[PDB]
Amino acid sequence: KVQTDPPSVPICDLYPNGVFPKGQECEYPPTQDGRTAAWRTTSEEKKALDQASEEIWNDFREAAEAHRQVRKYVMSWIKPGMTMIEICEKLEDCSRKLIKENGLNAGLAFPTGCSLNNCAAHYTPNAGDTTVLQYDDICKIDFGTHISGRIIDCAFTVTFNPKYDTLLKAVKDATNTGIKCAGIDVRLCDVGEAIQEVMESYEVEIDGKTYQVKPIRNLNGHSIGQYRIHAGKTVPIVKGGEATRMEEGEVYAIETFGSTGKGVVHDDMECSHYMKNFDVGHVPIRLPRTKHLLNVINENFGTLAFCRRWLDRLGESKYLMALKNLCDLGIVDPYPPLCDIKGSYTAQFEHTILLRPTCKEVVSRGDDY
Ligand SMILES: COc1ccc(Cn2nnc3c2[C@](C)(O)CC[C@@H]3OC(=O)NC(C)C)cc1
Ligand SMILES: [Co+2]
Numbered sequence: 001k002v003q004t005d006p007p008s009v010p011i012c013d014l015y016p017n018g019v020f021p022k023g024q025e026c027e028y029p030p031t032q033d034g035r036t037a038a039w040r041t042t043s044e045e046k047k048a049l050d051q052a053s054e055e056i057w058n059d060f061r062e063a064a065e066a067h068r069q070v071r072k073y074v075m076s077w078i079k080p081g082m083t084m085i086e087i088c089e090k091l092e093d094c095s096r097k098l099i100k101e102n103g104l105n106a107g108l109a110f111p112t113g114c115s116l117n118n119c120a121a122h123y124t125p126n127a128g129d130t131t132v133l134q135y136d137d138i139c140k141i142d143f144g145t146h147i148s149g150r151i152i153d154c155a156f157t158v159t160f161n162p163k164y165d166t167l168l169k170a171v172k173d174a175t176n177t178g179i180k181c182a183g184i185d186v187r188l189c190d191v192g193e194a195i196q197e198v199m200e201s202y203e204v205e206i207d208g209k210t211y212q213v214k215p216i217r218n219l220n221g222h223s224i225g226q227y228r229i230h231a232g233k234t235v236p237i238v239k240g241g242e243a244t245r246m247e248e249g250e251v252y253a254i255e256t257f258g259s260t261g262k263g264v265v266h267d268d269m270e271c272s273h274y275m276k277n278f279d280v281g282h283v284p285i286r287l288p289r290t291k292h293l294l295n296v297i298n299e300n301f302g303t304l305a306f307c308r309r310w311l312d313r314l315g316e317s318k319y320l321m322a323l324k325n326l327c328d329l330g331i332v333d334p335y336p337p338l339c340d341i342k343g344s345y346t347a348q349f350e351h352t353i354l355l356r357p358t359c360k361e362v363v364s365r366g367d368d369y
Helices: 044-052 054-077 084-099 162-181 188-200 288-300 308-312 320-328
Strands: 024-026 106-116 119-121 139-147 150-158 203-206 209-212 221-223 251-259 273-276 332-335 346-356 359-362
Touching: 044 054, 054 084, 054 139, 054 150, 054 346, 084 106, 084 139, 106 150, 106 273, 119 139, 119 251, 119 346, 139 346, 150 162, 150 251, 162 188, 162 203, 162 251, 162 346, 188 251, 288 308, 288 320, 320 332
Parallel strands: none
Antiparallel strands: 024 359, 106 119, 106 139, 139 150, 150 346, 203 209, 221 251, 251 346, 273 332, 346 359
16 A cells, blocks of 8 residues: 555555554763763663553554655645635645544544744634735644544644745754753753753844744643643743653653744634643533533543534534533633734744653654654
8 A cells, every 4th residue: 555645545554564653763862961871772671661662652653654644745735825724624634534533543633723923823713714825924834643642743834935944944943952952851941941042043034124033932842641732741942941850751742932023922813722621520511502512522522622613514503602611611721822923923843752761752753844
């Protein structure tokens, strides 16, 4: 089985042995002390511990190969003139095929972010959004795939005007720097300091104005858990964070955001993204529309994120009040778009990394980024 063009063959059918490709494997960084981590590549106890979780790494890899193949395809056709709805639907149709969507066992982990310009994250269109992608837009494509709740969170920035090339380079190099700094026993604050030093080493000129690239101080990366996009540890992108350490076996989304604005986001625009609170249990609901919607969410999404378009496509309509009810009850949380000031430009790059016992794997690395 070879992949089609456009892609249509599930990743699982491309690897008939069930063994998916590794991402980029890295020796961990040396410690402050100067000692190397070459020993892990080998310490017998570590190779056995690594191999004990092989089925888990393999699930991440299948999801990452889906991510690589979807994003390559997206880059081939994403163009100004398309609506944001057209972009997201075309991306998602392919993602569903290549992940071999199967309820909660394999699917889309969260909505397709396509945040534009001063909006940095958490924008995807709702029904009726007429927004059209423009030549001068700076669009963050952030989409997730999962196999058995093993989530790939990985993102890149699309542009068409070369004026943004150095801003993209800055943020890419900052994200790569974060990825290199990361490791077992590494302090999360140190990762933030390193990212911020790289990002701020860049100056850019856009339409005759100069800027020093600012990390967006109130955005961050995050640990990832099973069916849990944000498992509760934050990876800062500026100095001054927590000295909490990264641990063996954790998984992290190492994302950085750069801006030519204030370097701070606020909530703006209509909300599209929602997710069940992971920590809320069963709550009996008698209100019939509210009950029905929560059942739909439990069946289709569980604790994974969703958006309004994804309810629409299941045949739900006139659900907004019931969705507001679930938010007000604290069962569902809303995740509105996050924007810097009007006229600013924001960029993002992101990978998922596995802190395996024998090495650090940038599982979502491709030949693209
Ligand atoms: C509903 O769909 C999702 C999808 C991903 C996430 C995961 N997430 N959690 N926080 C953030 C993210 C994003 C979407 O990665 C972007 C970064 C943002 O950092 C942030 O807000 N930091 C403040 C809390 C200080 C959440 C919900
Ligand atoms: Co992301």
